[PDB]
Amino acid sequence: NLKDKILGVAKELFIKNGYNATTTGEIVKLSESSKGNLYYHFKTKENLFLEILNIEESKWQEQWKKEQIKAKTNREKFYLYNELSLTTEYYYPLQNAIIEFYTEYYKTNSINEKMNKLENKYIDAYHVIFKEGNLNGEWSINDVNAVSKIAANAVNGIVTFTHEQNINERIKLMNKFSQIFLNGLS
Amino acid sequence: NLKDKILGVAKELFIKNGYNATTTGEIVKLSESSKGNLYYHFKTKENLFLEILNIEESKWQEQWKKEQIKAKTNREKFYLYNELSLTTEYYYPLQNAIIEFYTEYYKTNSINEKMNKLENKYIDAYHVIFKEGNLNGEWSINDVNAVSKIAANAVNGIVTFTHEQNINERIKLMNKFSQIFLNGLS
């Protein structure tokens, strides 16, 4: 495909180098195409990026759907989501580029739109887990939205700032985290 | 002093033009030093910047050393420290040079090592809190080391991925988080 050959290399570079680190010039080189093609489908580099992000938040979200089954209680779904967060190949792998990107476009008021569109998607899994666990008497969360936001970010933190120690260390920490958080809800 | 002069000049250069932009050429001239001297104290730009980072960490600990006197109990110090990490970052001038660096040196073990002894220092503040809260029946963590790494990363996660909310909300969320986390020990 066309837009699909591009997107692949982009995601490739965005992760491997960083937002700016990677440029349109580059993309073309290992993607073969007119420096224009990238203009209809995607409005700009902000687009090509935001697109890749959109896909990823979809893929990962879907994977989770095809795996939460293995968790009978939401308490379990919570521990499980955070754990998978460490192994997946989606979204998280370019949280660094996102950080770059947000600090380099945060000044334009077009950020609070898409960078708030992917927001509700990212914190959704926790929404469901907490909301649904409320209906299932697993706990009693009054401020579900707050807690989802907290959870989502704290975890993204554990996932990101430990990207160097061994994977089993990460999983144990992540698990101790999950343990404590839930124990704090009630 | 001449070495301290370079560290000082380099710091302001980094703040004004970021990490990649700043050249050792400029650093050498504005501090009235030389390539030779710059090479002797630090060996590289990476090395020089990491050195800045260490000095900054020290001032931060020093600051905290004073600021905590305000918080009587360790439950309090926990709350305070997290809020402080959130607010000081809102306006930390090196914050951007940091990101531009960390996202360019996370695949090199040279920098991933020294940047680890650096994070451990940040994790110590927590360690102290928790060890001390123990000796006061404020709580009883049998894995102070682990809980500490968790606290550090959960919090930084909340600090790093939330820039799209008004500072008040951020503060609300971090304090809520501190409540949940501290409660997560009952």
Ligand SMILES: CN(C)c1ccc(C(=C2C=CC(=[N+](C)C)C=C2)c2ccc(N(C)C)cc2)cc1
């Ligand atoms: C986006 N990005 C590349 C980042 C984002 C945040 C940081 C961290 C940080 C830097 C400066 C601070 N102040 C001047 C107050 C406070 C915190 C930090 C994170 C984790 C950590 N630990 C693992 C313990 C220690 C520090 C570093 C890189």
